[PDB]
Design a protein around this ligand. Structure first.
Ligand SMILES: *[C@@H]1O[C@H](CO)[C@@H](O[C@@H]2O[C@H](CO)[C@@H](O[C@@H]3O[C@H](CO[C@H]4O[C@H](CO)[C@@H](O[C@@H]5O[C@H](CO)[C@@H](O)[C@H](O)[C@@H]5O)[C@H](O)[C@@H]4O)[C@@H](O)[C@H](O[C@@H]4O[C@H](CO[C@H]5O[C@H](CO)[C@@H](O)[C@H](O)[C@@H]5O)[C@@H](O)[C@H](O)[C@@H]4O)[C@@H]3O)[C@H](O)[C@H]2NC(C)=O)[C@H](O)[C@H]1NC(C)=O
Ligand SMILES: *[C@@H]1O[C@H](CO)[C@@H](O[C@@H]2O[C@H](CO)[C@@H](O)[C@H](O)[C@H]2NC(C)=O)[C@H](O)[C@H]1NC(C)=O
Ligand SMILES: *[C@@H]1O[C@H](CO)[C@@H](O[C@@H]2O[C@H](CO)[C@@H](O)[C@H](O)[C@H]2NC(C)=O)[C@H](O)[C@H]1NC(C)=O
Ligand SMILES: *[C@@H]1O[C@H](CO)[C@@H](O)[C@H](O)[C@H]1NC(C)=O
Ligand SMILES: *[C@@H]1O[C@H](CO)[C@@H](O)[C@H](O)[C@H]1NC(C)=O
Ligand SMILES: [Zn+2]
Ligand SMILES: [Zn+2]
Length: 158
């Protein structure tokens, strides 16, 4: 079982969260994490042409104006190659996961990190996953905002 984490838009968070806001993106895939973290030399070096096939995944780096392919390459190198063995299945899963994220809130969306906003008395979700996890930056007893969708608890089922 693989952790599936993604970023959520927020004008209040600098970096990708703000870029996503400006571009009308709500969810941008961060990664699919099996337990094993790749160490050592990748079996194949990912090209920009391969990495751009993950449509909708925005890079976390300003050095590419939040496009491709620093984050994508990093994901292949650190979590990809040693687990999927070939770039093809990995791009297919990554692309299809990002498609489901673009087509609204998934099956299980659980907050990972928040930015508590005093003006709206809300825990704005900056990163979510498909499994519950101890939170960070989330004020106790306050409601959650997953790219505008308001939820009672830390885990959103739509
Ligand atoms: C969660 O995360 C997991 C990773 O940690 C994901 O699992 C991986 O899934 C990918 C597919 O999405 C698998 O990738 C393929 O791997 C085979 C080789 O696998 C063989 O060896 C590994 C170990 O070395 C074993 O894998 C697993 O074993 C456990 C045992 O209990 C079981 O769970 C499964 O059996 C599982 O597979 C196992 O021994 C396995 O047999 C590659 O061959 C794949 O590449 C394909 O083959 C092409 C090369 O030649 C091919 O040419 C023709 C086409 O002309 C093909 O039809 C033939 O197959 C022929 O071989 C490639 O060029 C081409 O890209 C093609 O796709 C592919 O790399 C990977 O094994 C899984 N890894 C693990 C560790 O399980 C899991 O999907 C994730 N799940 C979710 C829900 O997110
Ligand atoms: C990646 O996912 C996209 C969807 O985000 C797939 O795009 C579809 O491609 C077919 C065939 O060209 C079109 O008929 C659909 O209209 C496309 N869908 C959308 C929503 O644009 C794409 O095929 C996927 N595969 C790869 C390898 O990138
Ligand atoms: C991002 O999420 C919002 C909802 O949180 C999407 O929809 C908004 O509301 C109506 C539908 O109820 C849409 O037609 C508007 O475009 C959205 N308005 C605002 C101000 O966000 C929105 O469409 C999603 N973005 C994408 C790319 O699908
Ligand atoms: C987005 O943030 C910038 C910088 O804090 C601010 O100037 C702008 O008014 C913000 N827009 C909204 C809609 O909050
Ligand atoms: C995408 O959505 C469908 C329907 O919710 C689901 O069955 C499928 O497993 C999802 N695909 C991925 C790659 O998460
Ligand atoms: Zn674990
Ligand atoms: Zn990583």
């Amino acid at each position: 079982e693989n952790i599936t984490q993604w970023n959520l838009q927020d004008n209040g968070t600098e970096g990708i969260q703000r870029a996503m806001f400006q571009r009308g993106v709500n969810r941008s895939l961060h990664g699919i994490w099996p337990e094993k973290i790749c160490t050592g030399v990748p079996s194949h070096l990912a090209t920009d042409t391969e990495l751009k096939a993950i449509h909708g995944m925005m890079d976390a780096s300003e050095k590419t104006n939040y496009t491709c392919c620093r984050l994508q390459r990093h994901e292949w190198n650190k979590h990809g190659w040693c687990n999927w063995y070939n770039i093809e299945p990995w791009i297919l899963l990554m692309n299809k996961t990002q498609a489901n994220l673009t087509e609204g809130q998934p099956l299980r969306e659980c907050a990972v990190t928040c930015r508590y906003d005093r003006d709206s008395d809300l825990n704005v979700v900056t990163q979510a996953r498909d499994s519950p996890t101890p939170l960070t930056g989330c004020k106790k007893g306050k409601n959650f905002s997953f790219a505008g969708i308001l939820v009672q608890g830390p885990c959103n089922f739509e």
